[PDB]
Amino acid sequence: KLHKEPATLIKAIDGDTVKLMYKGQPMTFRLLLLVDTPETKHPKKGVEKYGPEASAFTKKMVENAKKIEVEFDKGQRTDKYGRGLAYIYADGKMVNEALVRQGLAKVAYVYKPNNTHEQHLRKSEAQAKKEKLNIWS
Numbered sequence: 001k002l003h004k005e006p007a008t009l010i011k012a013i014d015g016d017t018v019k020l021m022y023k024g025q026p027m028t029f030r031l032l033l034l035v036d037t038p039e040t041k042h043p044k045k046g047v048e049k050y051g052p053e054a055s056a057f058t059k060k061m062v063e064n065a066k067k068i069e070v071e072f073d074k075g076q077r078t079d080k081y082g083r084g085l086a087y088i089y090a091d092g093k094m095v096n097e098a099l100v101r102q103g104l105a106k107v108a109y110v111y112k113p114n115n116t117h118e119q120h121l122r123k124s125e126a127q128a129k130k131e132k133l134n135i136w137s
């Protein structure tokens, strides 16, 4: 079973990459199962169509949260770049899914066993497509 753990915001970096104080140590966390478009991609040098709105949305959601919690999946907790891989919740709402529901990020990098909430995010993504939101307009 997965479970939520306390984390302190240190800084939001873009739509899907946030730096958090987790168990007393500063580290970059990357949101599982998403590809926010970037604010500072690498092919793209930077700023994507919808990458800066996905960044603003996560920035406000974590900045204004009363509390942040991280939820690791059941596979590896870290990727090759040493970023923590988690579902992040702000006030009990999953930032991963809110981005996807808004049509501000797409579901991507699905590596089992790290896909417990994959179907939940694919649903939210289907609805953002139906309603034609943002990247899907």
Ligand SMILES: Cc1cn([C@H]2C[C@H](OP(=O)(O)O)[C@@H](COP(=O)(O)O)O2)c(=O)[nH]c1=O
Residues within 6 Å of the ligand: 017, 030, 031, 032, 033, 034, 035, 079, 080, 085, 109, 111, 114
């Ligand atoms: C979300 C996620 C990304 N990644 C890797 C895939 C991509 O590697 P490559 O850089 O080699 O293409 C990169 C994309 O991350 P970003 O979207 O943050 O740039 O991070 C994982 O390995 N596992 C994951 O769960």
Ligand SMILES: [Ca+2]
Residues within 6 Å of the ligand: 014, 015, 016, 017, 036, 037, 038, 039
């Ligand atoms: Ca990104």
